[PDB]
A paper describes a structure:
Protein-engineering methods have been exploited to produce a surrogate system for the extracellular neurotransmitter-binding site of a heteromeric human ligand-gated ion channel, the glycine receptor. Acetylcholine-binding protein is a highly conserved ortholog of the pLGIC extracellular ligand-binding domain (ECD) with properties similar to nAChR. We therefore set out to generate a high-fidelity surrogate of this α1(−)/β(+) orthosteric binding site using the 2α1:3β stoich­iometry [Fig. 1(a)] by exploiting protein-engineering methods and the thermal stability of acetylcholine-binding protein from [name] (AcAChBP). Ultimately, the highly stable AcAChBP framework has allowed us to introduce nine amino-acid substitutions that have resulted in a stable surrogate for a heteromeric neurotransmitter site that binds glycine.
However, our structures also emphasized that accurately replicating the α(−)/β(+) heteromeric site required changes to the β(+) side loop C, where the major differences between α-form and β-form sequences occur. Single-site substitutions were not obvious and we judged it necessary to make a major change, with four substitutions being incorporated (S206K, C207G, C208T and P209G). However, variant III co-crystallized with glycine and the ligand occupies four of the five orthosteric binding sites in the asymmetric unit. With this proof of binding we named variant III glycine-binding protein (GBP). Solvent-mediated interactions link the Tyr212 hydroxyl with the carboxylate of Glu162 (not shown), which in turn interacts with the glycine amino group. The glycine carboxylate is directed towards the Arg74 guanidinyl moiety, but the distances (≥3.8 Å) are too long to represent direct hydrogen-bonding interactions and a solvent-mediated association is noted.
Author numbering:
A (entry chain C): 20 to 226, 245 to 249
B (entry chain B): 20 to 227, 229 to 231
C (entry chain A), D (entry chain E): 20 to 225
E (entry chain D): 20 to 225, 230 to 231
Write the structure that this text describes.
């Protein structure tokens, strides 16, 4: 308790917060998607609702410490308000993303941050053909809304979306689910930016006592 | 009033907040569920909505005091913002949990904290067969989202969900309701983590029902 | 303006906030319900929606002052964030209560606080029979979620719910509406706690 | 920029906020409604949804300044959080009011404040007869939730609701729309309070 | 990291925030709309729902710096809470606008600010005729809610709404989409104010 209090005090109260990347000090954020359910499909509005969590990893020198100086603490948990987090946005959402997990991150002695927000997302998807063998395919790009490719790079460890927590009794069966890094260019300023394109192909399933 | 003001001042304004558990100083959180209603079932989205409250208990040395030093105060109530609370999460929720009770906890002179949030939860459940005698079974795991089993352990006092506040005129009759501690392992990591599995077996209310 | 600024400064900035009742210094909260409408009835989910306001009264020595010392001010209005308020909860709600009025209370020179939140509440109610002469009865208990009867007592001034603001053209006609203090015990006779039971008997209007 | 920074610093950082009216220093608030649409009518719940904006005007000595001392600035815009605003409430709402405009007010050198919140409101209204020639009438009272008539008075500049921004292709046609000051009396208290009664007569478009 | 920390500290902690424009120091805000989808149409309430993002640009002397004094930093990203932003409002909305993007802006060494909020908007629109060839036309004015034309001017770089991110499989096909500056006058005070009128002509999606 006491060593961790010191560690957090040293990291967060002494110095200000990481202000974000720049051209001279860019940052790489690694993303992985863990799809849990296709909850809803709306053929009258062409909206589909996903529940997933999104593993995000990055690394900052400012969050390094020597474990020997803090009782051999190698990592800790702390509110996401205590740190900078990347502004990763679903570019074709139709409602604000709903947060399903606590806004808490894991910080490791080398300055690695892991943040794994669970989300419910409504996004643009025509579900016509979902009730067939071939099913339907839909896509959503995840990107930093404000940083170019000169400041932020996004990558994946694998192009396969993890389906190991996918709900076994979902209304919808997943045929294919990929997460692919792409290079893109803004309209008015033509400078590059990175996205990770989530492409999911799916179809309807077939074969002294108180407290109150 | 005056003694309590001193007590809260001494506990909360002197020291910073408990920063959470670590490998060297882990924490045990005890959970108990008090199911009040199955409000809704949606067969087109495979979502079911529960209303319950969840008794949570844990213990911290930093919240100890000697009652003799504070006018024989043995316990007090305080806003949950004044203290650390565990990040217990329904792992198969489909909407943010809605809070139905005040965010207030009870702290006791030995450093025990009791926090009993009432919640409405939407979660993943195929209700096909709910309109039969046998009914349907659904499950939801409750776990710390960010702490492994090295930092947080979860347990129960009993594996039976309390149904004593269950709505007598619910659309749904509870046939069985259990809360069972389970050991689990993360995919990429491989290190262990604990959940409490809430398993509820229910059906649409009928006169009476296997004869 | 100036005298009130002094008064609020003296009450709120000098001392900390009232920390809540204890066994040695318990508190009595008086409740009164003013039912305005039964807005919705859902027979598929057994939920009913009420709109009402709820008069709450309590009294603290820490909020007393002598009017002579503050330009004869007998009472004032202030944000509910400036003071402690009781944690009165509908025990069978199914959604978070929606707030329909400003979170502002009235404080009086004797230390009386009056807080009258307007609310929309969804709660557990089987409405089967609402479309008959006899109608249907539903109940919801209002209680402190965290305080026992040793710390908080609840009472009413009358056991009759006030229907003087009840919407004349509601879909639902009120046959009876009562608010009754009850003594209760946590689980298998644990320590006591108080609730006010709101019982409303109603039917479709003719 | 610099003069305005000084002005705001002088008004908001030196003195505390206006604490609200009292019996000895009451306040007059003028209201005007600008009805933009009847968006929805629900005959199963007797709820109707309006979109409008509400001009509110009041005056405080504490917000006066001499323009000559601040580069001839006669008025400015500032966040509503920087000032006191009246607690004007629709008394028969069924959902929390949704805010459609930025919470920003206009302050003028004589201490006049203009605040014009756009709102979407659900309120109690039986729409039976809306699909006829005569249409239907509905009413909603706007009042301070916590202040009596001894502390707050409400007035209008005209008893005619402004329909100049009313949506030309609404589902509903407005036949008449009035805003009328009324004197009222509390149940338990008996002391007076003021409301402005918004009465709208409308029907389905033909 | 260190130079940017200094820059932000110098701009935001030393001086107070820009207090907004005045008659003597007015501000020009340039708007551009990027329509992404017509999500919904409700013929029973005459409401239509758009998803778009809105590029906003303005310029303040108080946000200037010399890049040479801050490790050649030419621009940075920062929370919109750190700065003044214009109060641009859809005048015929029927629900609060829902925010779909992070509230973060880009500031450039000359004092230019770019803020590009993605929004979902419900607004007043009779969709009768949407299921025909000719389709239907709807309009929504975007304006400062509180500032007159003496304090705020709005303009566009083009009168064509950008449709390059418009969802190819939307229920609704865009026939035409324009963004036009207009001069307007308040009722009681007869002084001018500016809006940008977004006019969208569309129809339900449909050679054999
Ligand atoms: Cl950081
Ligand atoms: Cl703590
Ligand atoms: Cl208090
Ligand atoms: Cl003020
Ligand atoms: Cl600024």
């Amino acid at each position: 308790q006491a060593n961790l209090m010191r560690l957090k005090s040293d990291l967060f109260n002494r110095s200000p917060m990481y202000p974000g990347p720049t051209k001279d000090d860019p940052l790489t954020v690694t993303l992985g998607f863990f799809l849990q359910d296709i909850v809803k499909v709306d053929s009258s509005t062409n909206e589909v609702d996903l529940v997933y969590y999104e593993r995000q990893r990055w690394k900052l020198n400012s969050l390094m410490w020597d474990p020997n100086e803090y009782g051999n603490i190698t990592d800790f948990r702390t509110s996401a308000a205590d740190i900078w987090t990347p502004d990763i946005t679903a570019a074709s959402s139709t409602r604000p993303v709903q947060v399903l997990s606590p806004q808490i991150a894991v910080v490791t002695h080398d300055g690695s941050v892991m943040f794994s927000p669970a989300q419910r997302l409504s996004f643009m998807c025509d579900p016509t053909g979902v009730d067939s063998e071939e099913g339907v395919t839909c896509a959503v790009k995840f990107e930093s809304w404000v940083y170019s490719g000169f400041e932020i790079d996004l990558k994946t460890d694998t192009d396969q979306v993890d389906l190991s927590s996918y709900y076994a009794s979902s209304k919808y069966e997943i045929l294919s689910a990929t997460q692919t890094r792409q290079v893109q260019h803004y309209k008015g300023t033509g400078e590059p930016y990175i996205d990770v394109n989530l492409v999911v192909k799916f179809r309807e399933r077939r074969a002294h006592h108180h407290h109150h």
